[PDB]
C-alpha cells in the first residue's frame, strides 16, 4: 500500500470553468471517416482525438452555453456515402432534446424534418431540431437563417452555425428566454435592414440582429406560421413549447413506469391515478413553472362517447353508473393549466 | 380491431359551453312538403331530413 504520502505542491492560479446545467441534452451527428459510433461528451476537455479539427470546432461551438453548459452531448459519427436514416434509427433509441447536424444537404434536411414531424405526431415523442434553411410549419422545427457568421477571423455558413444556436438554446434556463440574448464570441454580421428583420420574424425565422453593443438574437419564435382555433399564438414561442414538452415527458415517464400493465382497470385505480397526477401538478405549481389553481378530472364526454360506440344502452342509466362503468382497457382524463410569458415589450411615456 | 398501446397527451385551449338538452316535453307538429312524407321523429338539431326546404326548416 506504500509509505505515507504528505505532498504539499505549489502552482499558479487556473481559470474557472462555467457551472454545469442539470437541464438540456443535445444530440449532434458528425461525419468522420474514423471512430464511428456513439460518444458521450460531458466536458470540453474529453474529446476523442480521431475527429478532425473542424469537427472539434463544431463540438466546441456546441459546448458553449448561454447561462450554463448543456448537460450532455451525444455524438453519432458516420463515415459517409450512407443514408441519414440509419443514423436516425439509432437516435430514436436514445433520449435527447435537440438535434443538429452541421454538415447538411437539402435532402438530408428534408429527411430530418419528415422524421421529427412523424415522431411528434404519430410516435408521441416530443423532440426538436435546429435546421439551417427549412420552411417547415411545425413547432418541432427551428429555422435559423443568418449568413456568414464570423468568429475569431473565421467564416461559418448558415448550416454549420446551428450547433452554436442549439447550444445557446439548451443553456437557457426555463424561467428565461432567448430573446435579445447576446453572443460575445461573435464579431461581425453582414449588413441588413430592420424592415427585412420584421418581415422575417413575421415569417417565422430565428435570425441574428445587430443592436447597441454586441450581436443578439432578435426574437425567440418557432417556425409555426399557420394558426387554428386549437393552436394559437402561444405555440409559436420556444419557451412555452419547451415547458409543455417537459410536462409531457414527465407524465409519460410516470405512466409508463408505474401503471401500464401493472394495475387492473377499475374506477378506484383511476381515482388513484388522478390523485398522482394532481400531486405532480401541485409540485410543478410550487416551482412556479405554471400558475396555481390547476385541476385534473375524469373526462365524462369521451367516456360516454366510447360507451355509445360499443353499443351500450345509456337509457335509464344514472350519471354515477355511466361514470363508473367498465371501459375495457381505456382511461379517459382531462386537465387544465396556465402558463405566463416573459417581458419583451415596454412602453414608457415621459412628460417634461 | 386491437392495436398497439396508445399513450397520448394533447395540448389545446379555449373550449366552449353548450345548452343542456332535457327529457321534458313532447310536441305534435304539422308541416307541408312534397317529399319525405309520413311522420318524422326528431331529438336533436343534427338529425333533420335534408328533404325539407329551408322554410320548413324554420
Amino acid at each position: 500500500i506504500g509509505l505515507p504520502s504528505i505532498n504539499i505542491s505549489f502552482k499558479e492560479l487556473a481559470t474557472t470553468v462555467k457551472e454545469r446545467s442539470a437541464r438540456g441534452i443535445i444530440a449532434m451527428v458528425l461525419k468522420d471517416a474514423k471512430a464511428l459510433g456513439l460518444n458521450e461528451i460531458h466536458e470540453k476537455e474529453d474529446i476523442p482525438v480521431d475527429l478532425s479539427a473542424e469537427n472539434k470546432e463544431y463540438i466546441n461551438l456546441a459546448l458553449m452555453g448561454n447561462v450554463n453548459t448543456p448537460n450532455k452531448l451525444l455524438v453519432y459519427v458516420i463515415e459517409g456515402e450512407a443514408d441519414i436514416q440509419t443514423a436516425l434509427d439509432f437516435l430514436e433509441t436514445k433520449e435527447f432534446n435537440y438535434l443538429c447536424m452541421p454538415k447538411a444537404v437539402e435532402a438530408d434536411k428534408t429527411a430530418i424534418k419528415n422524421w421529427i414531424i412523424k415522431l411528434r405526431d404519430i410516435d408521441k415523442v416530443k423532440v426538436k431540431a435546429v435546421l439551417g434553411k427549412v420552411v417547415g410549419n411545425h413547432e418541432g422545427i427551428i429555422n435559423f437563417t443568418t449568413e456568414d457568421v464570423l468568429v475569431g477571423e473565421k467564416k461559418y455558413s448558415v448550416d454549420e452555425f446551428t450547433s452554436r444556436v442549439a447550444g445557446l438554446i439548451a443553456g437557457t434556463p426555463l424561467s428565461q428566454s432567448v430573446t435579445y440574448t447576446k453572443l460575445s464570441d461573435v464579431v461581425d454580421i453582414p449588413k441588413m435592414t430592420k424592415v427585412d428583420a420584421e418581415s422575417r420574424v413575421n415569417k417565422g425565422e430565428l435570425i441574428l440582429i445587430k443592436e447597441a453593443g454586441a450581436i443578439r438574437i432578435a426574437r425567440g419564435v418557432n417556425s409555426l406560421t399557420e394558426l387554428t382555433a386549437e393552436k394559437g399564438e402561444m405555440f409559436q414561442k420556444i419557451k412555452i413549447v419547451d415547458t409543455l414538452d417537459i410536462i409531457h415527458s414527465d407524465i409519460r415517464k410516470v405512466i409508463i413506469d408505474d401503471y401500464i400493465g401493472k394495475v387492473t382497470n377499475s374506477y378506484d385505480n383511476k381515482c388513484l391515478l388522478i390523485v398522482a397526477i394532481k400531486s405532480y401538478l401541485e409540485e410543478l405549481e410550487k416551482s412556479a413553472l405554471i400558475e396555481s389553481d390547476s385541476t385534473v378530472e375524469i373526462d365524462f364526454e369521451a367516456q360516454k362517447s366510447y360507451l355509445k360506440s360499443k353499443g351500450v344502452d345509456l337509457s335509464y342509466m344514472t350519471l354515477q353508473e355511466i361514470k363508473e362503468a367498465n371501459t375495457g382497457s381505456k382511461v379517459f382524463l382531462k386537465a387544465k393549466i396556465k402558463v405566463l410569458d416573459a417581458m419583451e415589450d415596454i412602453d414608457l411615456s415621459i412628460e417634461i | 380491431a386491437i392495436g398497439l398501446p396508445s399513450i397520448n397527451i394533447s395540448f389545446k385551449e379555449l373550449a366552449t359551453t353548450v345548452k343542456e338538452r332535457s327529457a321534458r316535453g313532447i310536441i305534435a307538429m304539422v308541416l307541408k312538403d312534397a317529399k319525405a312524407l309520413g311522420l318524422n321523429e326528431i331529438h336533436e338539431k343534427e338529425d333533420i331530413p335534408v328533404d325539407l326546404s329551408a322554410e320548413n326548416k324554420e
Binding site: 378506484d268 381515482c271 388513484l272 388522478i274 390523485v275 394532481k278 400531486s279 354515477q320 361514470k323 | -
Partner: protein, 140 residues
C-alpha cells in the same frame, strides 16, 4: 324525497392509505377547525369575528391484525425524518343518492403504538393525525 333509508350507513366505508387498501378499518374521521378572532365594533352591541385560518385533525381506528403503522413510520421516526401520506375515503351506501370520495393530503401522524394488549380483550389501534390539504371526487 327523504326516506329513512337515505341515511348513509358507516358499514359501507372504504379507506386507502398510501395507495394501499386497508380492510380491517373501524372508523375514519377528518375535520377542519377554523381560527377566529373577536372584533368589537364601536356602536354595535353584537361582537363580530374575523376568520384567520384553519386546523385539520383526524383519526383512524382499525382492528389489530398486522404491523401496518410500525412498517410505515417506526424506523424513519427514530432517524429524524418525518414521512407524509395521502388517504382516500369512500362512503357508498346502495340506498343513498350517491357516493362521497375525499382525498386527504399531507398527513402526519401524532404517535406510534408498539404494544397494547389485555387478557380477555381483543386488540385495537387508534391513530390520530393532522393534515393540510384535501380534494373532492364524486360529491353528492
Amino acid at each position: 324525497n327523504m326516506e329513512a333509508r337515505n341515511v348513509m350507513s358507516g358499514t359501507w366505508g372504504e379507506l386507502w392509505l398510501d395507495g394501499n387498501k386497508v380492510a380491517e378499518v373501524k372508523k375514519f374521521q377528518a375535520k377542519m377547525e377554523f381560527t377566529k378572532e373577536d372584533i368589537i365594533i364601536a356602536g354595535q352591541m353584537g361582537t363580530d369575528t374575523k376568520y384567520m385560518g384553519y386546523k385539520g385533525k383526524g383519526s383512524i381506528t382499525l382492528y389489530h391484525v398486522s404491523s401496518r403503522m410500525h412498517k410505515l413510520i417506526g424506523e424513519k421516526i427514530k432517524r429524524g425524518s418525518e414521512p407524509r401520506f395521502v388517504a382516500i375515503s369512500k362512503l357508498n351506501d346502495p340506498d343513498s343518492y350517491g357516493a362521497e370520495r375525499i382525498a386527504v393530503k399531507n398527513i402526519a401522524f401524532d404517535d406510534l403504538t408498539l404494544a397494547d394488549w389485555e387478557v380477555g380483550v381483543k386488540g385495537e389501534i387508534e391513530a390520530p393525525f393532522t393534515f393540510t390539504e384535501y380534494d373532492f371526487l364524486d360529491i353528492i
